[PDB]
Design a protein around this nucleic acid. Structure first.
Ligand SMILES: [Mg+2]
Lengths: 675, 105
DNA sequence: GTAGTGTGAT
DNA sequence: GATCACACTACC
């Protein structure tokens, strides 16, 4: 086993030069430094470890070091270098598995200061190295009187960089050993720094292997990117922008501008008693100024004559305070307030506001439309993370994915978040989803557009629930899902009027639907919602049994254990005993979907298909229970769809799932059609 | 004696009026405006036939003030022939007002 | 840049 | 009785 790290001149997308690298070999216990001209020898050392059936440890190597070395080897040495997945270990991936209850800065892309909770120390240092190096560099330059230019610390190799590279491996080794010390994932009887790659994966907990396969696959997905129709969005943006201006024009006419205190320095004090008047707006008291200089003083102020500085404010529909101010003046009486005491001003509340001025009542609809238009504009074009700001030269958006970003094992997505694109059922959703599609990528050889295969796990949440309650109902629920009609079964369990009421009700328990939100499905409130839940549970004893069994393993708020064992054996941190069941369900679904996409890609590759734009298919996005895959031809799209079903069945059998697992696939040109 | 203006009556009551007109742009939430109000009442009565004192509450009449670039209140604008002759911002005392007027009339 | 509020998705 | 990204205002 060896631990290593490299320094290069840029992020993966544009890296062109290897600066240095360091390798620590456990078999010799020595650190070896490789400078710019030692690049070929560096690669040779890594391949020698592979020749021995060994392992290579990197921190964030799956996303950066490994693919960067392949790229740089071809570019600088005209050499084919491809480290096999099975020989690589990533301490960042390992950290996210073992310390899944903690956030991390994802190698400095996130400000550590804004994250909630504590941060693992070694990982913190590794993520901050770039920023620390830049500060040393900047400090040294200025000490010598020369100007610092953004990013210049990475243009050339220097010994300070080499020193940071060494420190990096030192810390990565420390991190590695701390992670291997966790007996839950690594049996204490084995020294994992002294085994071949096969032993490492086979003797460690299954979750270790699964997380590395997931990270390897998702790194490839990031590199593939999601083909994006830039022109379509630029045109959508003109349309939205014009509608925004028109709504603003209409709203500013209806709601006039006004003046507010602004810039006042001193406190207004009663002129007679001198009593400070903290609540009055702040004033300013001219130090100079008079009537004459006699020649008249054409200055606006008079020494000692106080005034209140004010500013002109134009109605801003994006301001929930402006909205609240104008609606109350129109006679609106707020009923829902926030902790800070502010009136709630969201779409549901606005939908319910009634004022007698006809034009102002109608303006509420304009305001809601305006908020929605802005939402779309911010996401597609104006926000810091807008799609138009991220689309690359290859015409694709390469969104980042943290394979194990959430406590439950779900992945998190960002830069931009491709897991939050408006659905086809929402306003402008069809145009948004249509702009993301394999059709927008032209084949590198033939110029013909690729086609898309959209595959989703069918009702995964209910099947996970069925699985876990099988211990209590012997598969009754699972049997109903796949043979009868689980929805009408739940409809009867509860009392809800129609079948669709049951579908809303059930999903409600899953996605934070409170009692008021429940009763509000049949046209009521809390009570008719608090009774619907109880009634449902009394008519579905297996769910109640599951809930008590889950908590008996966690509680006696003294805990017996603060985690639940996931499908692959990992610890899944439970935040609240009340959220235990959903934690259990969401985690099962996440691990099932993770193994599923891993197995699907392996089977496609086993069938001889090549992953990549220069091949047959390309993973473009993975959004929890769904994957969008670009395919060179319709025939391949068909194979992907069939293979994904086979892979899902393999997963169900692999973990002895008590409910049969299924998928449904659709072929089309884009995400709008493959929903 | 004080004329209470509106946005819609401003043009006729101020800009097309004969003789000097002192306009006070005020708001009820301003401490200083409250201080000078009592003063303006005595000025209107004392300068009648010589000057016309008018008030425009900027909250109920939001259209006018912006046209004159108000940045603070109270703001006293002295109009003559539809043109702003003079201007002072702040809660002046009776004396500072009397001398401001006498001097500008 | 932080705090408060909301909306986008599973 | 859920997980998480991100924008926009208001204030420092
Ligand atoms: Mg590194």
């Amino acid at each position: 086993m060896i631990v290593s790290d490299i320094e290069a001149n840029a992020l993966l997308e544009s890296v062109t030069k290897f600066h240095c690298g360091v390798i620590y070999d456990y078999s010799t216990a020595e650190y070896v430094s490789y400078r710019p001209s030692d690049f070929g020898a560096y690669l040779d050392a890594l391949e020698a470890e592979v020749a021995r059936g060994g392992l290579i440890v990197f921190h964030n190597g799956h996303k950066y070091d490994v693919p960067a070395l392949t790229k740089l080897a071809k570019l600088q040495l005209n050499r084919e270098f491809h480290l096999p997945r099975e020989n690589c270990i990533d301490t960042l991936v390992l950290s996210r598995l073992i310390h899944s209850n903690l956030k991390d800065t994802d190698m400095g892309l996130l400000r550590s200061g804004k994250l909630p909770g504590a941060l693992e120390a070694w990982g913190y240092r590794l993520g901050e190295m770039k920023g620390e190096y830049k500060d040393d560099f900047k400090r040294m330059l200025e000490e010598q009187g020369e100007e610092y230019v953004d990013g210049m610390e990475w243009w050339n190799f220097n010994e300070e960089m080499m020193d940071y590279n060494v420190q990096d491996v030192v810390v990565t080794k420390a991190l590695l050993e701390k992670l291997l010390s966790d007996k839950h994932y690594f049996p204490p009887e084995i020294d994992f720094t002294d085994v071949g790659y096969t032993t490492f994966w086979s003797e460690s907990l299954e979750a270790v292997d699964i997380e590395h396969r997931a990270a390897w696959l998702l790194a490839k997905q990031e590199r593939n990117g999601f083909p994006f129709d830039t022109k379509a969005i630029e045109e959508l943006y003109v349309e939205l922008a014009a509608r925004r201006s028109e709504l603003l024009r209409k709203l500013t006419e209806t709601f006039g501008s006004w003046y507010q205190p602004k810039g006042g320095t001193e406190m207004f004090c009663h002129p007679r008693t001198g009593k400070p008047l903290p609540k009055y707006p702040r004033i300013k008291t001219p130090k100079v100024g008079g009537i004459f200089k006699c020649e008249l003083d054409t200055r606006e102020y008079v020494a000692g004559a106080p005034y209140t500085p004010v500013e002109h404010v134009v109605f801003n529909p994006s301001s929930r305070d402006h909205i609240q101010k104008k609606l109350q003046e129109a006679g609106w009486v707020p009923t829902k307030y926030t902790d800070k005491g502010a009136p709630v001003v969201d779409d549901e509340v606005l939908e319910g506001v009634r004022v007698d001025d006809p034009e102002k009542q109608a303006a509420i609809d304009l305001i809601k439309e305006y908020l929605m238009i802005q939402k779309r504009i911010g996401q597609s074009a104006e926000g810091d993370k807008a799609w138009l700001r991220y689309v690359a030269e290859d015409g694709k958006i390469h969104g980042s994915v943290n394979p194990n970003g959430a406590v439950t094992g779900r992945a998190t997505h960002a830069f931009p978040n491709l897991a939050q694109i408006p659905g086809v059922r929402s306003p402008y959703g069809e145009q948004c989803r249509a702009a993301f599609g394999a059709e927008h990528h032209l084949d590198g050889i033939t110029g013909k557009p690729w086609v898309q295969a959209g595959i989703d796990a069918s009702g995964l949440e209910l099947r996970c629930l069925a699985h876990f309650m099988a211990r209590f109902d012997n598969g009754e629920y699972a049997h109903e899902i796949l043979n009868g009609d689980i929805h009408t079964k739940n409809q009867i369990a509860a009392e809800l009027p129609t079948r669709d009421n049951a579908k809303t009700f059930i999903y409600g328990f899953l996605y934070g639907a409170g009692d008021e939100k429940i009763g509000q499905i049949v046209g009521a409130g809390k009570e008719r919602g608090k009774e619907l839940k109880k009634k449902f549970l009394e008519n579905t004893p297996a769910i109640a049994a599951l809930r008590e069994s889950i908590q008996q393993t966690l509680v006696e708020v003294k805990w017996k254990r603060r985690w639940i064992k996931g499908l692959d054996g990992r610890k899944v941190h439970v935040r609240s005993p009340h959220a235990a069941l959903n934690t259990l369900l969401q985690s099962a679904g996440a691990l099932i979907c993770k193994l599923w996409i891993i197995k699907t890609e392996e089977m496609l590759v086993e069938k001889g298909l090549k992953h990549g734009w220069d091949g047959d298919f390309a993973y473009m996005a993975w959004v929890h229970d769904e994957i969008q895959v670009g395919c060179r031809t319709e025939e391949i799209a068909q194979v992907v769809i069939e293979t994904a079903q086979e892979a899902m069945r393999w997963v169900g059998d692999h973990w002895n799932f008590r409910c049969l697992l299924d998928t449904e696939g659709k072929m089309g040109p884009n995400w709008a059609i493959c929903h | 004696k004080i004329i209470h203006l509106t946005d819609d009556s401003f043009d006729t009551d101020v800009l097309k009026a004969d003789g000097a007109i002192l306009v006070d742009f005020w708001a009820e939430w301003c401490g200083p405006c409250k201080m000078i109000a009592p003063i303006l009442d005595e000025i209107a009565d004392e300068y009648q036939g010589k000057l016309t004192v008018a008030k425009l509450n900027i909250d109920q009449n939001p259209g006018t003030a912006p046209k004159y670039g108000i940045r603070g209140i109270p703001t006293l604008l002295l109009f003559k022939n539809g043109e702003v002759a003079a201007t002072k911002v702040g809660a002046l005392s009776k004396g500072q007002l009397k001398e401001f007027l006498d001097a500008n009339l």
